[PDB]
């Protein structure tokens, strides 16, 4: 077939260089960008239907997620209402539903419980004062998270979600599922448990729950178990019998309606001492300014919460945008969600993001634009203004059971952990480390630990690279490892070393050790022995994979060259890139008789030049 025939002079860097010579409206994203281009002729009906469905789902979702935060039920409605209104303007995505999320709500509740415990705040029980303090703390945290997100949007650093690798995301997801399950199991059993803040809090909480298991309430446990069983059975049936009924069945809404109707009919509050919400405010509360003096105690938590919420939002937005053929601006997502969280924090709400289960419901029912979001917000308004009194008999175990039933998809990643281990060990290590760290520590500290562990893994992989001793395939220009191909001939009196990594301080010491191993000696010892008295004459360094270089690497290379030239051993460099040669030039490498004459384009010019002498 085709043949490889090339005729050219043996080119050094100097010869090659002397023959061939070198050398305002999008930031505040308007609705005016797509409202004037609306298609009300056919989009309006689908938008209305989707908005009604997703509002019905989101009212219950907000009420349930208000329990994960240490906030009385009723502010979850505000958290499901206000962010949608303030995101309708600045939002890029046209398919996501804005509101609470079980993991972000759990993080917020952990912070709120830490800063306002029952025993520390009250020594009288003063439920009203405690609830007011918890609401204030949640609002302050939401405002801080919004400020951080807006600042990140201003700096246009939207690539940080790249650092959230899939293995650490999976580990954090599994740990968050465990945390949410423990909290909601505490709620379901109607068992009191003093809050634990700090390290290994989940283990202490589980121990105390299992100690007090003898004080469980029968009615709440039965309601939670039945809700979980019904919801999971319906989900499984819909998933298996999926060709018909394309849209998911809103089983949670039906279960909640039936449960609250039965509770009203039987009056479970007094006859069985059941735990009901017992209080939902009527109407809208006036806005209040949160106390910013707490900002110094909520930095390591607000940073993690902002990162996680933005990551979930952009993940869902991208998943639907690639499906519907459009693009989302990450910096604009920062800006929109930061404004949303600031607005929410000024109106007694906890942190807002998107949810995959709610977005799927909104999209599958015919979502076109964010008009469905406005319809959902209107439904939440109707629930707040009028439906407040009819949700009083509802039990909290029903909402906790809904959350527990939904936790399955998050719990199902230990299944693909082993495949990840089989493919790449580093990714499995990252997964396990992130999960364990988020279990031993909190979620906010676990996320930071996982991120920095990923950074360490990258640094370590760069630091300990693959290196080889090379020899030529006969009658070709192909050089491979001598100990791998069994037909490789080492050239006469010259060793070729390939160090497949950029050279920096860790790589500096690694490279010195590798050179000493490959050439069979070191220049310092032989030079000292020769001075006291008073096999290889050339070494080629294949530098085709040296991506970058620093001052320490340049100094190391200079010292290597000088030490080998002391004992009359020549050092040549091959396949160095142009920018690395520029870095060598600007770091003072080409001083004291180097002159760029020991550089060749590939590892065949060096060997041919060696044969000349």
């Amino acid at each position: 077939s085709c043949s490889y025939v090339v005729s050219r002079p043996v080119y050094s860097e100097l010869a090659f260089q002397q023959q061939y010579e070198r050398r305002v409206l999008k930031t505040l994203l308007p609705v005016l960008d797509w409202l004037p281009k609306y298609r009300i002729k056919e989009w309006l009906l689908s938008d209305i239907i989707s908005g009604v469905s997703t509002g019905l789902v989101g009212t219950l979702q907000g009420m349930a997620y208000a329990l994960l935060a240490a906030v009385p039920v009723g502010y979850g409605l505000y958290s499901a209402f206000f962010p949608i209104l303030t995101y309708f303007i600045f939002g890029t995505s046209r398919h996501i539903s804005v509101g609470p999320f079980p993991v972000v709500s759990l993080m917020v509740g952990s912070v709120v419980l830490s800063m306002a415990p029952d025993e520390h705040f009250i020594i009288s029980i003063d439920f009203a004062a405690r609830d007011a303090a918890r609401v204030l703390i949640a609002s302050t945290l939401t405002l801080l998270v919004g400020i951080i997100q807006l600042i990140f949007g201003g700096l246009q650093i939207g690539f940080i979600v790249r650092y959230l690798a899939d293995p650490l995301v999976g580990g954090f997801t599994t740990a968050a599922a465990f945390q949410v399950l423990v909290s909601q199991l505490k709620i379901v059993l109607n068992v009191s448990t003093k809050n634990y803040n700090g390290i290994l809090s989940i283990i202490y909480t589980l121990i105390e729950i299992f100690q007090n298991i003898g004080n469980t309430n029968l009615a709440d446990f039965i309601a939670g178990l039945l809700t979980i069983i019904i919801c999971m059975a319906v989900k499984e049936l819909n998933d298996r019998f999926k060709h018909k009924i394309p849209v998911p069945i809103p089983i949670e809404v039906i279960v909640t309606i039936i449960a609250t109707a039965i509770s009203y009919a039987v009056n479970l509050e007094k006859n069985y001492n059941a735990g009901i919400v017992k209080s939902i405010p009527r109407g809208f509360l006036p806005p209040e300014i949160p106390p910013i003096s707490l900002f110094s105690e909520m930095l390591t938590a607000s940073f993690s919460i902002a990162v996680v919420a933005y990551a979930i939002a952009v993940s869902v937005g991208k998943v639907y945008a690639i499906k519907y053929d459009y693009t989302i601006d990450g910096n604009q997502e920062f800006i929109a969600f930061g404004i949303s969280n600031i607005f929410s924090g000024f109106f007694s709400c906890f942190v807002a993001t998107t949810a995959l289960s709610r977005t799927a419901v909104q999209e599958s029912t015919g979502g076109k634009t964010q008009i469905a979001g406005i319809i959902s917000a209107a439904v939440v308004m109707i629930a707040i203004v009028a439906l407040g009194k009819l949700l009083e008999p509802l039990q909290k175990s029903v909402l906790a059971a809904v959350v527990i039933a939904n936790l399955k998809g998050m719990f199902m990643q230990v299944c693909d952990v082993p495949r990840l281990w089989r493919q790449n060990k580093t990714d499995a290590v990252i997964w396990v480390f992130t999960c364990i760290a988020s279990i031993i520590l909190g979620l906010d500290l676990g996320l930071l630990a996982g991120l920095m562990f990923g950074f360490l893994t990258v640094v370590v992989r760069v630091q300990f690279p693959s290196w080889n001793s090379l020899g030529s395939i006969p009658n070709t220009d192909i050089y491979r490892s001598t100990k791998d191909y069994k037909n490789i001939e080492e050239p006469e009196g010259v060793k070729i070393l390939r160090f497949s990594s950029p050279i920096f301080y860790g790589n500096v010491d690694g490279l010195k050790k590798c050179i000493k191993s490959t050439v069979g000696f070191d220049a310092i010892r032989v030079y000292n022995k020769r001075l006291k008295a008073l096999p290889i004459h050339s070494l080629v360094l294949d530098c085709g994979a040296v991506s970058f270089l620093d001052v320490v690497g340049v100094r190391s290379l200079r010292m290597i060259v000088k030490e080998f030239q002391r004992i009359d051993v020549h050092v040549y460099f091959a396949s160095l890139q142009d920018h690395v040669i520029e870095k060598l030039e600007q770091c003072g490498f080409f001083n004291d008789s180097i002159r760029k004459d020991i550089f060749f384009l590939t590892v065949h010019d060096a060997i041919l030049h060696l044969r000349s002498q």
Copy 2:
């Protein structure tokens, strides 16, 4: 001259692979390793002289460094005595002098002051109880540091000192010099200042010192100023007039002797209210067991102290070992210094390492083995037993002035900062960040921040690499950037992209963006447009610099190949290494019609194969 002539078939990976087929006594280092091989015939006299000189220096150094720790003078003698005895056995280096170091002592003193302040401990002044508590805390910290160092020696992780890059070491050195100068200036002026623990403590200390500057003592200030001037003048004269008097002049010992003799003669204590040591114990105190219950409050400090002390020790040891033609074991250095610090902590001592000035004094006077360490320990013992009473009149301002005079070499690195900026910007950024973060956060937190920042810099440099679009030099096999050489011809209907970095998640998104920019489009949009309806036909990826690869990178490459094959655009890979191909194989890449047939050895086989079709 020589010519590049090669004739061979156009080799793909499959064709090449089917044609050429692949495939107990040192740990407890004895003195018995070198004592039986002693050369007492001529080494003994030089060892004795060097030991006497370095013991005279080290007694004063220990007394001076005992002030940097919040410990009464007298335990510095123990810290200069015990570690030498316990290092004489396990030590590898034969030229270093073991004892206190100003930066490590300052770190210990900061911890001790934080855990035992004057106002918190005493509300009576109870100097004896405060001193006892400070000594206990220092001993506990020393024991913890020794435990950590011994554990690190057991794990044989001695390469961690690689992570201490030269720029961050220089920045930390300058910050530590500033901290030591502030503390010793507080001591010299005889001005009381309430201790500050936390963030920006140095600024508050300086502000209060300048506020109380009106309460300075004249005698102490004059003594300190004269000592500083005399010491620095003698050092500069010796450095300039260096051809004669090869050994350094022990000006500090002479100054201290003269100052204490004058203080005894004039009795400066009562006539001028001067600040003298006033108390030096007679003899040796019995050992005591430190309270380990404090270990939970000294982790982030003990880790940094251990790292810094070991780094200084190995640095000095290597500097002298390369000079005298021998090698030092890093893990054995961990083991020796961990045992030394445990032994010191059990005997009321603070953390021990080596000092460059003391080591230079010991070596320049004919140091041969670690017998000069034993002689120095004997001199310190003589000073403890007998010379305790004659050092009572000595002022503390003299010792603080000695430390301040020695701080010049550490202060003299801001001069080399700008050259580092001119050569490599990342190294200068690391230097400045490490300097700044150790003044705001302190030394122990500053070191960790600098290490983290170095890891982030490495990750960022890997994440944003150099990428190019390649074309061939005519009548050769040389491919260079099209926009650089002005004689580069792009081939017919094919683009060649070089991405010079290993491919991971950050590099995954970077690579997708780079491919989209280079080919002028993306496969998803054109495929969707073509489906709605119902310039380049090949893309070569030069992967000669892809050092490693993970699961995310493999998935990204698979998706890129599939998306481009959807629109009848062929994707070829060239210059991939064998281990990266193995990683692709074990990550499931070669499934669903890939078959390793689109891989070529260099970027000339791919273009020749393209010309065939």
